[PDB]
C-alpha cells in the first residue's frame, strides 16, 4: 500500500556523489593492474563466475515469430544477432562488477537507426549521484587526459550500470570486494615481502672470517682488505682450498631455519578465504579436505557462491540493458519473458550422461538435449517423446531386437 | 503468485541473508503508479526497529537513517511492513536474535587471537641479525661506534652471498625465529568459531582425522542438514503467512485462504543418489512422484502422469513386440 | 577456462579484423557471412568424448557425433541428420535374426 | 577449562622478547636507563627484518612458548561435556580411534537412536 | 577460407604468441603481383607501437627498426595493417598489456 516506498535508506549525504572517491576506484585499478598473486585470484574469481559463457532463453520464443529483415526471427535469434558476442561482453562486466562496485557502460547506435552494441565504460573513471531514495540519478566521470584530468556529466538516462556486490537491497552503487578486503589484501602483499628480504638474509648461509689471535695483537681495516682479496666470494670456486696459520678462522653464518612455506600456506589460506575462493586456488592445499563430505561441502559452496552472483548479474543484464534494447530498436515484445542464463563452470558431462542412463525413461527428449547441452530435435513430435530418437528412428521397421 | 515474484530466488537469498546476520528481515509492498502490486520491497534492517505491546506483538515500527547532516528519524504503523524473524528465544518472541550479537565475545576472541597471530609472526616468525661489537670484560663502544658498524652490516643493503671479514671482537650473532604452533592456534580459533556459528568445522579451510569418514561424517552432515530444514521451514511458513498471503488478497482475483506453500531447495542433494533410488524402487513411483524427486516438470498428460510405469515404456507399448 | 577466455578473444578479434575484410576485398562472397573461427581444447580426452557416445550416442545426431568426435560429417545428408549410427543403417540394408 | 586455556594461548602460547641490560655483577641499570633502551626495541614498532647492533653488555632473550597440549585438554572437556549431555562425541567436533569403525560405531549410534 | 588461409595453424601459434608476450599481435594485408590475396602478413611486434585518438581507436601505426647505421622510423595508416589485444585493462581499451611488463617485478624476483 505505497507508491513511493515510505522506508528511508541510510543516504550518507554529508559525505558529490558516494563516499567512493576516485582516487578509491583508482586504487581499484591500481591492485586490478600490478598482477602477481591477488589479481591472478581475482581474475580466477571472474574466470569462474563468467568464464562458461552464456545461453538465451524467451518463455514462449516460438510464438513471438516475426518477419524483421523480410524474413522470420523470434525474439531468441533477434537477440543473439544482436548481441554476436555476449560471451566476452558476459566475462567483461562480470569480471568488473567483481572488483568494482558496478560495471557500467552506455547503448551505441549505427550512424542511422540500428542498434550497434552495449558498449562498456572503463568502471574506476565513473562515480554516480544518488537521490535521497538512493536511485542514481546522474553520473560523474574523471578521465586523464593532455593536463592531469578532464570532468563530465550524464543523465543516467542512457547509461546502464549492473551491481553483483551490495549492502541490501536499496542498494544502487554496490561494494568494491577489493576495498571492502583492502586491509587483508595489504597484510598479504607485507608478509610477501618480509619472507623475501627474509630469504635473501637468512635463506643462504654467509662465510665470516676472523682475523687475528683472541686476545692478541689487534688487525685494522687495511690488514682486513687484505684478508678479503684472498677470501672473495666473487673470485673464489667450489674446489679452492685455503693454508693459514693459527690465527684466521674461516666460520660460517648458517642458513638459520624458518618455515616460510608454512606463512606462505597461512597468508594464501588468509588470502583466498577472504577473496571468497577454495584454498585450492592458491596452489595450497589440506590433509582429508579434499576427500569425502569435507570436499562435497566446499565445492558446494564454490557453486552457491557462482550460482548467487550468476544470477544476480543475469536478471540485472536482462532488465536493464536487453529490455530497453528490445523496447528502442527491435519489433518484438519489450514484456517478453527474456531469460540470461551463464553455464555451471564446473559441470562434469561424464555425471550428466551417468544421469541420462539411469533416469532418461522419464525425461523428454528434449529435457535430455538440454541436460545434455544439445539443440533440442528437428521435430517437435520427437522432441516431445521419453523414448529416445535413435529408439525410434529404429522403430522404422527393426526386428527380433 | 510466480508472476507475481518473478525473481524470488533473489528475494529469498536477500532476507534470508538478513534475517540470519539481524533479529529479522523488514520491509514493504509497492504498488504501481495506479492499481496493481509492484513488489515486495525490503528495508535495510540495521535502520528499523519494532516497538512491541505488552503481549509481545510488534505495534509500530521505528527508523533511524543516515542523512546530510547526522540522522534523521521516522515511525510507521506496522500495517504495510511485514518482517520474518529465523532466530527466536521461543514462541511469543516477535522481535528474535542477532546470532551476530550472541555470539559477540567468540567473535571478538577470534579477532583478537587472529592479530595475536600476526604480531607474532612479524616478531618471532622470522630471524633477525644482533652484531655484538668489542671485547667481553674489554673496551667499551658507544652509538657512534655502532653506527659505523650498522652501515657495515646494514640488512638493506647485504645479499645473499655477502661475506664479512673481522677482527676477533665482533661476533655475528643471530635471533632465530622461536618455532611456535600458530597453525593449531588457528585451527583451534576456526573450531571454535565455526561451532559457534554452528557451521561444520570444514567450512572455515580446517579440517578434523577420522570425522571425514563413516557413521562421524554421517552425524555432522546430517546435524547441518537438520539445521538449514529448521530455518528454511521456519522462513518458508513465516513469508507466505504475512507477505504472499497479504498480496493474494490486496492485489489478485484468487482466494487467500488457498493452501500455497513456498519450498526451498536443499543445497547438498546428490542427484546421483536420487537416480540410484528412482532405479531400485521407481516401480512404487507414480511418474509425477519421479518427476518431483527427480526435479522435472510432470507429464503432459495426466494419465500418463499418474501411472506408475515409466511414460517411455507406455510410449514404447504403442506398438512394440519381441522385447 | 583461461584457454577459452583467451581463445574466444583471440578468434572473435581475428575473423572481425583479418578474415572479413579479406572476404570483401579479395573474394566473390558476402563478407556479412556469420564465420567463425574456433580453436581447439589442447586438453580433451577421446576416451572421455568416446565414453559420452557410447552412453548418451542415442540423442546425437550423427553430424554431432562427428563433430565431438572430430571426424568429418556423414557423405549423404540424410544419415548425417539420422540419430542411429550409420553402421547401424548400413547393418539394415537387409540383416536378420540380431 | 575453556577460559583456562583461552588465558594460557595469551600468556605461553606466544613467544616474548626479554631483553637484558648491563654487566653482569657490573654496574645497575634504573628504569630510566631501561626507558631508552626499551625504546630501541619496541616490538610496536619493531619490523619482521630489523637488526640490532650492541656493545656486549645487552642481551636479546627470549621466552621461548612453552608447549601444553591444549588440543588433549579440549578433547577431554568435550567428551566430559557431549557424554554428560548424552550425545556422541562426533557432534563435539572431535573423534576418537576406532571407533569411527565396525561394531564399535554400530554401537554408539545404535544407542543415540 | 581454407583455400585463402592454407597454414592457418601456424599463423594462429604466431599471432597468438605474439599477442600474449606483447600488448598486440599486428600485421598486414598483402597480395600476389596483380589482383589475388597472398597472405595475411605479420610484422615484428617490438618494432610497432599505435597511435591512439582522444576515443582510444589506433589512427596510426610508429615503427622503429634496426639498420644499416641505428635505427630507421616509419610511419603507417592504419587502414591495411590489422592488430590482435589478447590481454587488455578493459573494453576501450584498443593498445592492450604486455604479461611480460605487468609482471616484469615477479620475472626479476625469479631471476635474481
Ligand atoms: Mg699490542
Ligand atoms: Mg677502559
Ligand atoms: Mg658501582
Not at 530497453?324 to 555451471?344: G, Q, T, W
Request: aromatic letters at 6%.
Amino acid at each position: 500500500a505505497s507508491s513511493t516506498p515510505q522506508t528511508n535508506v541510510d543516504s550518507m549525504g554529508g559525505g558529490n556523489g558516494q563516499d567512493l572517491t576516485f582516487e578509491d576506484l583508482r586504487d581499484i585499478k591500481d591492485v586490478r593492474d600490478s598482477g602477481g598473486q591477488v589479481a591472478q585470484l581475482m581474475d580466477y574469481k571472474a574466470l569462474l563466475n563468467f568464464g562458461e559463457g552464456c545461453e538465451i532463453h524467451v518463455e514462449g520464443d516460438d510464438e513471438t515469430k516475426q518477419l524483421v529483415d523480410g524474413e522470420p526471427m523470434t525474439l531468441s535469434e533477434w537477440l543473439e544477432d544482436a548481441f554476436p558476442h555476449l560471451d566476452l561482453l558476459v566475462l567483461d562486466l562480470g569480471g568488473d562488477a567483481l572488483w568494482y562496485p558496478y560495471a557500467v557502460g552506455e547503448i551505441q547506435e549505427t550512424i542511422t537507426g540500428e542498434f550497434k552494441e552495449a558498449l562498456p565504460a572503463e568502471p574506476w573513471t565513473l562515480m554516480p549521484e544518488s537521490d535521497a531514495q538512493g536511485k542514481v540519478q546522474a553520473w560523474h566521470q574523471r578521465t586523464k587526459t593532455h593536463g592531469g584530468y578532464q570532468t563530465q556529466t550524464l543523465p543516467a538516462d542512457d547509461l546502464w550500470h549492473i551491481v553483483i556486490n551490495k549492502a541490501s537491497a536499496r542498494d544502487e552503487v554496490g561494494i568494491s570486494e577489493v576495498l571492502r578486503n583492502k586491509d587483508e589484501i595489504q597484510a598479504f602483499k607485507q608478509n610477501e615481502a618480509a619472507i623475501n628480504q627474509a630469504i635473501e638474509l637468512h635463506g643462504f648461509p654467509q662465510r665470516h672470517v676472523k682475523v687475528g689471535k683472541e686476545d692478541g695483537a689487534p688487525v685494522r681495516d687495511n690488514d682486513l682488505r687484505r684478508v678479503r682479496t684472498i677470501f672473495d666470494p666473487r673470485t673464489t670456486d667450489a674446489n679452492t682450498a685455503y693454508f693459514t696459520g693459527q690465527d684466521v678462522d674461516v666460520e660460517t653464518l648458517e642458513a638459520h631455519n624458518f618455515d616460510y612455506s608454512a606463512i606462505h600456506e597461512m597468508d594464501m589460506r588468509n588470502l583466498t578465504t577472504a577473496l571468497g575462493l577454495p584454498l585450492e586456488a592458491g596452489n595450497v592445499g589440506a590433509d582429508g579436505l579434499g576427500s569425502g563430505k569435507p570436499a562435497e561441502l566446499r565445492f558446494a559452496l564454490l557453486k552457491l557462491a557462482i550460482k548467487a552472483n550468476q544470477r544476480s548479474f543475469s536478471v540485472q543484464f536482462v532488465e536493464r540493458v536487453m529490455r530497453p534494447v528490445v523496447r528502442d530498436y527491435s519489433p518484438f515484445d519489450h514484456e517478453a519473458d527474456i531469460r540470461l542464463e551463464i553455464n555451471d563452470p564446473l559441470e562434469d558431462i561424464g555425471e550428466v550422461a551417468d544421469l541420462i542412463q539411469q533416469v532418461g525413461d522419464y525425461m523428454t527428449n528434449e529435457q535430455v538435449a538440454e541436460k545434455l547441452d544439445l539443440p533440442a530435435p528437428e521435430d517437435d513430435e520427437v522432441a516431445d517423446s521419453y523414448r529416445s530418437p535413435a529408439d525410434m528412428e529404429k522403430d522404422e521397421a527393426g526386428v527380433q531386437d
